[PDB]
Amino acid sequence: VKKLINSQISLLIGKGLHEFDSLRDPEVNDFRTKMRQFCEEAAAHRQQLGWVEWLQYSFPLQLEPNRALLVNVKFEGSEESFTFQVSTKDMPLALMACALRKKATVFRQQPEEYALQVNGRHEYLYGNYPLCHFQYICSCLHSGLTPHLTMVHSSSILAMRDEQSNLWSLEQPFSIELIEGRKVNAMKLVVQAGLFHGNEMLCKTVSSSEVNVCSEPVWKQRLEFDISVCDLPRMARLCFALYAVVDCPIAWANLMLFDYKDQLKTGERCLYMWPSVLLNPAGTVRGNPNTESAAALVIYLPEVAPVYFPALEKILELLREILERELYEHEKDLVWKMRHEVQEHFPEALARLLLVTKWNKHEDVAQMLYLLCSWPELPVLSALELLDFSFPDCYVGSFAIKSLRKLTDDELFQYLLQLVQVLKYESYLDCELTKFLLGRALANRKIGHFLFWHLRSEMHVPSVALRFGLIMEAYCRGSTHHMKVLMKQGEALSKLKALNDFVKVSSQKTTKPQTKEMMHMCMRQETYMEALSHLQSPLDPSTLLEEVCVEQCTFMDSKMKPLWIMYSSEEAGSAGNVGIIFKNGDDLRQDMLTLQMIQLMDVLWKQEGLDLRMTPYGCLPTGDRTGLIEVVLHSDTIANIQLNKSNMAATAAFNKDALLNWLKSKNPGEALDRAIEEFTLSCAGYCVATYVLGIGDRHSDNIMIRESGQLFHIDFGHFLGNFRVPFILTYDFVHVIQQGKTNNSEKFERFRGYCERAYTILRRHGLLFLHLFALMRAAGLPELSCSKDIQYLKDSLALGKTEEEALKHFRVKFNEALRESW
């Protein structure tokens, strides 16, 4: 059986476990056994949670960031059901109490023994929260639908938990022998080598001698560094670049100077190099796995004798405010001079102080560290900054995580993407971020779900295959049942891939009707109906994808022929009708990032009492240029609506009215007012978001409308101006906002106010967007590479200005946009 699990994990993670063994690597070995132990204890803890606590793990609450409503309630093993009138202000307990009085009178005769399940979803209502604080109840109130809930007893929840069981001494210069290589090229070869601590060089770079493109080249030369061996910090990174000149980059490679056991490295190393875009301090510190073809480098670390980085005990033993809100040398000097006063009176300036400490002088690093050890904990915002590559020191990183432990699960969820990308900065396999991520993942199944997919979706990338593989295995050890739930998900994704391939071939040889009919036959095969039905959605583990609705599945006409799959569910009713899009061949990472940022804006806006009626729909890369998009039902693109089709409700005399006619047919009489309002609020949100994010190429094919009137955006291929994208006012939206009128400054100016409020709120969290984008730089996304992309966000949010200047400036961009509206 232990054999069976092993094989199922290998299949799930997209890598055979035997492949970890073949490496015969102490570090991999150690990571695997340590992390397995840590995960198994978390799984032990879990099997003994109270039932409310188990619910908290398995289905965490979906909460928002007087009035009467109707709700329908039923008991688990029963057809019969009761509709109740309650207040939005009532706790779930009150509602559970009615349900039992209604049961007892029909049936002829304790609320605390139950929780409420959302019908046909893995979602639950419990806690001390007014009904309208639950996202589900909120949703229902807006759309107008009646909440439908099931009373699930405590014994039923426990049956679920039950079924889911499992040194200072060395003053001489640092130096290496560069021995030889075995590359490929056209001219002379050179090797540049520098020592780095993050971005900062620890001393000048040093160069090789020139030897012709010859072989299989040989050097046997000492390269000596203009720093002493006792001054190398714990996180010292030696970087190499090999190129050609009479400039032509060939390859690079980096390693840590201390291994994972803190021991300084000696003697000979073989370095399998990565092929180039000259020095790459931020690149991984593990060699290329394609050792068959990779250019190799042999160097020799000299035996300085066995030496270890001194323990913490030995470490411990050893106009200010005016600037303190890029600094000159003397400025740096004051800060260092006044570090105690910084620790005492300005703890939040830790980072600026860290950036001024001389990391190439051990006495100084000792002193900076001395302060770090008694530094008070910092807010989440500050901690996120410290995770940046600018702070490679492990005591800093450890302090950062320590300051992050106070993340709520909702917050952790919101930043999960960036924390994962930061893993690519790590120097070793066993690290605080990993154990942190895994422990929080083992305490929250939703966290666990998205961690798994963020990791799984990158297994085709050699620089991270090993690390990410190792983490997913360890997690699997911590949850056998969820492993099985995830495979079921991977099996469906495997079949969609095969079906998508057929559709690609087929569509090149036959008409769309014929391909769709054969797609349906293919889907109707037993293997497919089985693989495609009865899973949790990778887009949202609380969404259940029950019976695939074959007749309604089809595909889109764009290059990659993405599949459009519909599902239904008797037990969920209408909310069990959900749709996913499967795309293979395009990159979805940029869309996911953009959509997480828009969703963050929505959270910040709602935290200040501003709901702009956003449509934050799921988007999730799952594999190599593979992932899923959630279908927002009851929506259509502007373009489709603007086709101005005859024999249709929305039949216009002027194309400018098409959109308004459409909203009118979806929203008869009095409902129209609210639809126009919903359109107005969301339009503001999206105009601000796309402006702040530099999302261009917006047009009537990538903008959508919901039947409620909410406007949203799909298919982002560009952001951060990676085409300065101007603010955008489209006429036809302005026409809707104006309720059809040529002049309606009263409506138009409400709309301006919404844009300004939304904009000024985001400026106030400008710093949170900058730290998050900074961490995203580790993604390797082509439009998020360097400083100018970040600067795009400084400029868009005008963060160097007072609120009055930024607003005035914004007013010019906006007024400029209105002129541009015809």
Shortest reach from residue 116's CB to ligand GD9, in Å: 29
**Measured from the CB of residue 714, what is the shortest distance to ligand GD9 in angstroms?**
4
By beta-carbon proximity to ligand GD9, the closer residue of 286 and 698 is 698
Q: Output the smallest distance, CB 728 to ligand GD9, in A.
A: 19
- Residue 588 Cβ, how far from ligand GD9 at the closest point, in Å? 7
Choose between 418 and 590: whose C-beta lies nearer to ligand GD9: 590
If the CB atoms of residues 705 and 734 are measured against ligand GD9, the closer one turns out to be 705
- By beta-carbon proximity to ligand GD9, the closer residue of 337 and 634 is 634
CA dist., res. 432 & res. 35, Å (int): 12
Name the residue with tokens 């965490």. 60
Nearer CB in complex with ligand GD9: 388/540: 540
CB 651 to ligand GD9: min, Å: 21
DSSP helix/strand/coil, 242: strand
Q: How far is the CB of 556 from ligand GD9 (least distance, A)?
A: 4
Rounded distance between C-alpha atoms, residue 271 and residue 273, angstroms: 6
Tokens 């601000």, residue located: 688
Element (H, E) at 413: helix 409-422
Q: Of 198 and 576, which has the nearer Cβ to ligand GD9?
A: 576
Handedness of CA 227, 229, 234, 240 (dihedral sign): positive
Task: Provide the residue count of the chain.
Answer: 822
Residue 238 or 629 with smaller CB distance to ligand GD9: 629
Give the nearest distance from C-beta 703 to ligand GD9 in angstroms.
11
Cα 259–Cα 265–Cα 266 angle in degrees, nearest 5:
150
Are 494 and 34 spatial neighbours (Cβ–Cβ below 8 Å)?
Answer: no
Nearest approach in angstroms of CB 220 to ligand GD9 is: 54
Nearer to ligand GD9, 513 or 609 (CB): 513
Provide the minimum distance between the beta carbon of 715 and ligand GD9 in the complex, in angstroms, as a whole number: 4
Taking Cα atoms as reference points, which of 251, 295, 254 lies closest to residue 276? 251
Residue 63 to residue 305: CA distance in whole angstroms: 61
Nearer to ligand GD9, 471 or 714 (CB): 714
- The least CB distance from residue 631 to ligand GD9, in Å, is 5
H-only helix segments in 643-730? 658-666, 671-692
- Least Å from the CB of residue 457 to ligand GD9: 16
How far is residue 660 from each of residues 472, 542, 617, 733, 748, measured CA to CA in Å? 50, 35, 24, 9, 16
CA–CA distance, 556 with 548 (Å, rounded to integer) = 18
Q: Nearest residue by C-beta to ligand GD9?
A: 557
Q: Give min distance, CB of 563 to ligand GD9, in A.
A: 10
Dihedral (Cα; 38, 42, 44, 49), 10-degree rounding? 170
> Phi then psi for 667, rounded to 5 degrees?
-140, 70
Task: Quickly count helices (H) and strands (E) in the chain.
Answer: 31, 27
Q: Which residues in 158-229 belong to E strands, given as ranges?
A: 173-181, 188-197, 200-201, 206-207, 211-212, 218-228
Say if CB 464 and CB 513 are below 8 A apart. Answer: no
* Pick 316 or 556: Cβ nearer ligand GD9: 556
Helix axes 671-692, 658-666, angle to 10 degrees: 130
The residue among 548 and 620 lying less far from ligand GD9, judged by its C-beta, is 620
**Alpha-carbon span 353 to 325, nearest angstrom:** 12
At its nearest, how many Å lie between ligand GD9 and the CB of residue 615? 8
**Would you say 432 or 783 has its CB closer to ligand GD9?**
783
Residue 579 — φ and ψ, nearest 5°?
-135, 145
Angle at 591 between CA 589 and CA 597, to 5 degrees: 105
Q: How far is the CB of 598 from ligand GD9 (least distance, A)?
A: 12
Residue 230 or 565 with smaller CB distance to ligand GD9? 565
Closer residue to ligand GD9 in complex, CB, 104/556 = 556
Interface residues toward ligand GD9, by CB under 6 A? 556-557, 581, 591, 617, 619, 629-632, 635, 637, 714-715
Nearer to ligand GD9, 444 or 626 (CB): 626
- CB 510, min distance to ligand GD9, A: 15
- Beta carbon of residue 719, minimum distance to ligand GD9 (angstroms, whole number): 13
Neighbour-count burial for 726-765, b at 16+ CB within 10 Å, e otherwise:
ebbbbebbbbbbbeeeeebeebbeebbebbbbbbebbbeb
Nearer to ligand GD9 among residue 410 and residue 715 (C-beta): 715
Helix (H, G, I), strand (E, B) or coil at 286: coil
Residue numbers after which the chain is interrupted (C to N above 2.5 A) read 65, 109, 166, 186, 246, 277, 305, 318, 325, 723
- Residues pairing with 537 in the sheet: 540
Q: Quick one: CA torsion of 349, 355, 357, 359, rounded to 10 degrees? A: 140
Count of CB atoms situated within 10 Å of the CB of 210: 12
**Which DSSP letter does residue 726 get?**
P
